[PDB]
Design a protein around this ligand. Structure first.
Ligand SMILES: O=c1ccn([C@@H]2O[C@H](COP(=O)(O)OP(=O)(O)O)[C@@H](O)[C@H]2O)c(=O)[nH]1
Ligand SMILES: [Mn+2]
Length: 304
């Protein structure tokens, strides 16, 4: 309940689901009868998702996947669901995301109109150029903020859908009609981790500040919020909607930074002094049974 105000720390049952996501631009990389989840010796991601499941057998574990997968890879996913009742694998194709949409044309026009109100001296001139050009070009085909996020966004593809999935949260397991899940109810929470996260011992219940907590990394002497960990009390947690509000309003907004980090700041009215590091300590998702993030030591799943 730290400052400025008093915030009700929340606690959610062991029956809180866990969420993993794998978005693969290149399903051809893997074979056509095995799992399209990567586990290089450098980055044993699928192995980490398997290790987590075992431990928290009681808890649900979900995987959010998208890409154009070959049937034997889908058949392979179907097998793992048999192997572990606690694992569910949800596809982007199977979830309605329409409610969270805002068509690209409106975003630009509202920015144009707002920019046009102020006088010619005050207006952002370069921004208006970019807006009108974007409006004319983006016309071709289909104008949806979700459609805007494709494999070619690359980084954007999963980051934005990461926020969509967390917005759905518990509802996501319910929405897919994944089975063996009679623990939880709509308007129930869920925890996202990167496959970078290795889980030593089952975590039990956790107190998070206002129904949300996120990953924090402190190097060299500075901390910034990270999307490796996202914990929510709730489906549709107000910090994410506020982040989505940026997604709907701010031009060229980054889902990683604006969608969440900015949303959280908004919710707790951080700015600005308000020294960050302690605020990062306040928001920080802390646990002694998780290693984070294990891409740090080797090479990020994104090649380099
Ligand atoms: O091709 C990829 C690579 C990564 N990820 C997601 O991003 C996380 C791992 O990214 P990583 O942390 O290794 O990259 P970094 O953020 O360190 O650059 C995983 O949990 C995946 O959910 C993905 O969906 N597709
Ligand atoms: Mn990582």
């Amino acid at each position: 309940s730290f400052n400025g105000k008093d915030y009700p720390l929340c606690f959610l049952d062991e029956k809180t689901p866990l969420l993993f996501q794998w978005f693969e631009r290149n399903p051809a990389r893997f074979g056509k009868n095995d799992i399209p989840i990567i586990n290089t010796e450098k980055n044993p991601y699928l192995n980490n998702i398997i290790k987590a499941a075992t431990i928290e057998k009681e808890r649900l574990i979900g995987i959010f996947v998208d890409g154009d997968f070959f049937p034997g890879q889908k058949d392979a996913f179907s097998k793992l669901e048999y192997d572990y009742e606690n694992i569910k694998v949800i596809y982007r194709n199977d979830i309605d995301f329409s409610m969270y949409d805002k068509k690209l044309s409106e975003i630009y026009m509202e920015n144009i109109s707002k920019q046009e109100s102020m006088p010619e001296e005050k207006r952002d001139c370069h921004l208006l150029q970019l807006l009108k050009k974007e409006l004319s070009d983006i016309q071709e085909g289909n104008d949806s903020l979700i459609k805007s996020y494709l494999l070619d966004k690359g980084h954007g593809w999963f980051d934005f859908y990461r926020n969509m999935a967390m917005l759905k949260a518990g509802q996501l397991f319910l929405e897919a009609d994944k089975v063996g899940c009679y623990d939880l109810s709509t308007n129930s929470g869920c925890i996202y981790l990167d496959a970078d996260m290795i889980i030593t011992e089952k975590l039990g219940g956790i107190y998070i500040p206002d129904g949300i907590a996120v990953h924090v990394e402190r190097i060299d002497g500075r901390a910034s919020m990270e999307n490796g960990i996202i914990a929510v009390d709730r489906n549709n947690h107000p910090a994410l909607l506020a982040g989505l509000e940026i997604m709907h309003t701010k031009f060229d907004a980054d889902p990683y930074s604006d969608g969440v980090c900015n949303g959280i700041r908004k919710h707790f009215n951080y700015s600005l002094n308000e020294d960050y590091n302690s605020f990062c300590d306040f928001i920080e998702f802390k646990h002694d049974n998780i290693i984070m993030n294990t891409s740090q030591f080797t090479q990020s799943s994104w090649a380099r």
